[PDB]
């Protein structure tokens, strides 16, 4: 059947970047043309693969990580960047083979008065490793004295909210992101393009 990309890209609700949602896609025919021929995507950078010849290849699995960030942070969803997001929220590996897709979601994720559901991680004791995700709400210690309840001398809650208002600057508007990673194992290739040897 047709791979359920509709359910990922047209997802009614999206996830906070700190708790980025992954969907494994398997056992279907992936019509990648439907994506790159929707010319509504503001970012569509692919690394290590052809633009259209993905439509001919087969893969053991396709993983779709998806989340929401602000526009000027999109540049961090790429190999070997630093910044709040790539360091503390969603790190891509250096040898990344796959595609990063982003589009402006101001008319869906901003609301008059402000949307404070979409969060991100502000403080972490160290950097995330590639494809790692952290959703702990452990009280961050920046000061010297231990915290055990809520807050004290430099004892910040680690998560912060984006404030998404429809009248924010373009750079401060919400963008929805989908990262396709491709997996080819010594195992049955279940995700195939229509122009393959298999059909």
């Amino acid at each position: 059947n047709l791979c359920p990309f509709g359910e990922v890209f047209n997802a009614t609700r999206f996830a906070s970047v700190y708790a980025w949602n992954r969907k494994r896609i398997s056992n279907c025919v992936a019509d990648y043309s439907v994506l790159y021929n929707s010319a509504s995507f503001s970012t569509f950078k692919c690394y290590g693969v052809s633009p259209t010849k993905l439509n001919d290849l087969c893969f053991t699995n396709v993983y779709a990580d998806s989340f929401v960030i602000r526009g000027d942070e999109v540049r961090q969803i790429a190999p070997g960047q630093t910044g709040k997001i790539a360091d503390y929220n969603y790190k891509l590996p250096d040898d990344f083979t796959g595609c990063v897709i982003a589009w402006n979601s101001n008319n869906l994720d901003s609301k008059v008065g402000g949307n404070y559901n979409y969060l991100y991680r502000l403080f972490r004791k160290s950097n995330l490793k590639p494809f790692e995700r952290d959703i702990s709400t452990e009280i961050y210690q920046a000061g010297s004295t231990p915290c055990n309840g809520v807050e004290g001398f430099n004892c910040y809650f680690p998560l912060q909210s984006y404030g998404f208002q429809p009248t924010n600057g373009v750079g401060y508007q919400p963008y929805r992101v989908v990262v396709l990673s491709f997996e080819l194992l010594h195992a049955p290739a279940t995700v195939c393009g229509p122009g393959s040897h298999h059909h």
Epitope: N21, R22, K23, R24, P93, D95, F131, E132
Partner: antibody, heavy 128, light 108 residues
């Protein structure tokens, strides 16, 4: 008490085949990646296979690729290793082990950290 | 991909002992350390480079930087004499790799 118990080892002839079991108890088995790791006599630990909390994804070491099959029955709290075409260099103690990370169930995401629970092992001698 | 350890490391009781583990871009993956006494199963003593599991003595610490992970036992004791293995789970391929192990002798 968290507990892993291996069983089904023994003496077996090369080229034949054998099915090992690992019985889990005292934790929500269905929510953890599981490992098979072996140790030949006087050698080090050799990774054999690994399986996702739900059995969706399976990875094998090259030495056993195509010959072994890892599987799990989540309803019965059990991990299985089907060993086929046994060679002599397969003689070893076989441990099952649990990864310390658990999936909540909601979005096909898993990251493997250390293997914090180990069984006591089951011994497989493959001789003619 | 291979993780390569010192074959043996001896140490007097009370001294600090260090076991190294080298691999290609090992800093970019998490390292685990397991202890195995004779005729016993392995036990996890370090995970996530430096975190110590519940119930593991505090004298066990761990680091990982560059291409080298290091298990450190300060105040080494008789009951620490064992084989120690490092391990890395590649973030890609989801492929597990042990080290050759290290025979930590405690001169008792």
């Amino acid at each position: 008490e968290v507990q892993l118990v291996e069983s089904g080892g023994g003496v077996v002839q090369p080229g034949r085949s054998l099915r090992l079991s690992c019985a889990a108890s005292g934790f929500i088995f269905s929510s953890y990646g599981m490992y098979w790791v072996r140790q030949a006599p006087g050698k080090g630990l050799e990774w054999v296979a690994v399986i996702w909390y739900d059995g969706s994804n399976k990875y094998y070491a090259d030495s056993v690729k195509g010959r072994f099959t890892i599987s799990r029955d989540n309803s019965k709290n059990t991990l299985y290793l089907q060993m086929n075409s046994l060679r002599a260099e397969d003689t070893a103690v076989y441990y099952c082990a649990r990864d310390l990370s658990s999936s909540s169930g909601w979005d096909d995401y898993y990251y493997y950290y250390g293997m914090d629970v180990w069984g006591q092992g089951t011994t497989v001698t493959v001789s003619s | 991909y291979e993780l390569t350890q010192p074959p043996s490391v001896s140490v007097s009781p009370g001294q600090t002992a260090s076991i190294t583990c080298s691999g290609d871009k090992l800093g970019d993956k998490y390292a685990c350390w397991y202890q195995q006494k004779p005729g016993q199963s392995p036990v996890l003593v370090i995970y996530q480079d430096s975190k110590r599991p519940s119930g593991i003595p505090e004298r066990f610490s761990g680091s990982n930087s560059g291409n080298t992970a290091t298990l450190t036992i300060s105040g080494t004791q008789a009951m620490d004499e064992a084989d120690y293995y490092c391990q890395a789970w590649d973030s890609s391929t989801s492929y597990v790799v042990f080290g050759g192990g290290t025979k930590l002798t405690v001169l008792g």
